Amino acid sequence: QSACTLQSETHPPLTWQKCSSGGTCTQQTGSVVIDANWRWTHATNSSTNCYDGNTWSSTLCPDNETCAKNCCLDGAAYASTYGVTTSGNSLSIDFVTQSAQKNVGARLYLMASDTTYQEFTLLGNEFSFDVDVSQLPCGLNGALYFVSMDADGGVSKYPTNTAGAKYGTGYCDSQCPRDLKFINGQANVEGWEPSSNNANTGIGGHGSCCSEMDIWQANSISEALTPHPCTTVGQEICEGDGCGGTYSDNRYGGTCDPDGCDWNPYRLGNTSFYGPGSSFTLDTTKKLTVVTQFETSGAINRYYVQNGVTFQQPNAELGSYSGNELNDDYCTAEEAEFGGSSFSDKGGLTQFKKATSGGMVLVMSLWDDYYANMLWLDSTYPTNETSSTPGAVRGSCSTSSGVPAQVESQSPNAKVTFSNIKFGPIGSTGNPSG
Ligand SMILES: OC[C@H]1O[C@@H](O[C@H]2[C@H](O)[C@@H](O)[C@H](O)O[C@@H]2CO)[C@H](O)[C@@H](O)[C@@H]1O
Ligand SMILES: *[C@@H]1O[C@H](CO)[C@@H](O)[C@H](O)[C@H]1NC(C)=O
Ligand SMILES: *[C@@H]1O[C@H](CO)[C@@H](O)[C@H](O)[C@H]1NC(C)=O
Ligand SMILES: [Co+2]
Ligand SMILES: [Co+2]
Ligand SMILES: [Co+2]
């Protein structure tokens, strides 16, 4: 697609700290950009929609290539349309925003310039952030994560995409998502099927795969940390159900691992660690600091800080694994005890280390789940299982929770706030900000 300018595109600024092993941190100035799927897609020389509701224009978009030639992405009114605001080092995303139409949540990328994404090399480094999840009920997910996206959003590889990172193109993740309207400088109209339950969405014939590091999948009830390997490390197109993931009939039939090696302390047995109020180790009614360290072995370490008190990731025992480091012994034990083979099939932490050794883009989002109601995060899943099934119970939410239309109606003022991002060598991010 090209870019159009009927609406101006001004990326909300966002600062973050780059820390050094020598013990000091220096402020960096970036900004955030909304993913292309949220945008108005229209004809290049008129206001006629190329996509509207859950359908493509059959005249502007008779095929993927003609559609991309005929159509452009336009600018976003971040606060008034999308409920996205920033202040200094803080980013807030509202759940439901009513303008001329309804908007639900957002997916945002951290930029390096107005036309390029910031890339982070995670291996050997740690990433710290503060989060307020107090306004996130059952069924919502305020996510902070990394994906192996191109810094230009795909423009150099696919010159029929001239919109680029400035307009939030080029997304990919471990689901190999097929709901994206543009992939590789082509529309996704071929094979398009409208969603049953979401007036704005559908599933196309193509998806967009890449490695994904889920630092933070969370609401006020549950949280998870999850690396996902893919056999191709960076962004790559996939065809139909060969994509696997959420948007295919067969979840596990693709090149990425859509499940990952997940670490959810509640799922692992510590049901007192994270939740609302003073009965939990971490009180989700209050802001908390989350630090994630990527040691060069390929294992992942985690600690938290709240009110000046530090807690390592709680210990878990699973089969012959015991500890609090997410390492290959953990991931192997998890597959043995909970089931599944996707993580190991895709090469495990060794394959995942190829992603963290390269550049990855920072994503912050707020979503509800039109496929599984977020039950995999915060409830019992599948819903016919009980606590007698190892790993079935992931949180205390009812198996009836998280229906998108219901939570949108009941909790429209829900929101997530991410703040005080700090990044640098392991051991460095707790030192004074600059
Ligand atoms: O695609 C939704 C969500 O899935 C997460 O994996 C789940 C999976 O959905 C479920 O079928 C299995 O039983 O459990 C795993 C781990 O909870 C995945 O980790 C997320 O990244 C993804 O957003
Ligand atoms: C949960 O984790 C916290 C922090 O490590 C610990 O203090 C507490 O004893 C744990 N509870 C259980 C049941 O494992
Ligand atoms: C729940 O339903 C699934 C269907 O996929 C089945 O595999 C499983 O055996 C069922 N579990 C129980 C405890 O009935
Ligand atoms: Co194709
Ligand atoms: Co099939
Ligand atoms: Co280690």
Side-chain angles (χ1 to χ4, degrees), residues 40 79 84 122 131 138 144 154 157 189 196 276 283 285 330 345 426:
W40 182 25
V84 172
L122 293 174
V131 65
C138 291
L144 184 151
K157 290 178 187 166
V189 57
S196 302
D283 178 351
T285 70
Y330 170 74
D345 283 346
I426 290 167

Side-chain angles (χ1 to χ4, degrees), residues 295 297 299 301 325:
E295 68 182 43
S297 75
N301 286 288
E325 181 184 68

Side-chain angles (χ1 to χ4, degrees), residues 56-71:
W56 293 90
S57 168
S58 58
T59 54
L60 288 166
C61 294
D63 66 80
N64 289 344
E65 289 79 16
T66 304
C67 188
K69 178 68 173 76
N70 286 340
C71 302

Side-chain angles (χ1 to χ4, degrees), residues 242-272:
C243 292
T246 294
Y247 302 97
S248 300
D249 74 335
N250 183 10
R251 189 170 173 86
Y252 302 110
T255 58
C256 282
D257 160 30
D259 278 20
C261 171
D262 67 293
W263 191 300
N264 171 340
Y266 194 109
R267 192 178 186 208
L268 295 170
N270 194 330
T271 65
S272 295

Side-chain angles (χ1 to χ4, degrees), residues 82-221:
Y82 302 104
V84 172
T85 57
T86 61
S87 181
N89 69 31
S90 186
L91 165 67
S92 287
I93 310 168
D94 284 346
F95 188 43
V96 178
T97 302
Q98 180 72 58
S99 58
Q101 306 292 145
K102 182 184 160 176
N103 175 77
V104 182
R107 178 168 67 243
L108 301 158
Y109 316 117
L110 183 73
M111 304 197 84
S113 70
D114 274 330
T115 55
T116 62
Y117 300 128
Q118 182 64 60
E119 301 276 353
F120 291 85
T121 298
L122 293 174
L123 191 75
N125 294 305
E126 73 190 23
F127 185 90
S128 180
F129 67 100
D130 297 350
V131 65
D132 187 331
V133 301
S134 67
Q135 308 307 300
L136 300 173
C138 291
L140 278 66
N141 187 342
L144 184 151
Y145 62 107
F146 287 91
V147 289
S148 300
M149 284 165 65
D150 285 352
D152 62 2
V155 175
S156 73
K157 290 178 187 166
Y158 308 105
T160 52
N161 171 9
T162 62
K166 184 171 174 167
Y167 291 83
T169 67
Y171 184 65
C172 54
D173 69 31
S174 75
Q175 301 305 299
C176 295
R178 296 167 57 180
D179 69 303
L180 305 180
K181 284 173 287 193
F182 295 90
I183 303 167
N184 288 9
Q186 294 175 172
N188 203 11
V189 57
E190 296 176 45
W192 195 259
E193 299 295 354
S195 294
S196 302
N197 57 345
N198 187 331
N200 285 313
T201 69
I203 295 174
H206 291 152
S208 189
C209 303
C210 67
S211 302
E212 178 204 15
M213 180 54 219
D214 312 354
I215 304 288
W216 190 250
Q217 306 259 27
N219 51 43
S220 65
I221 302 303

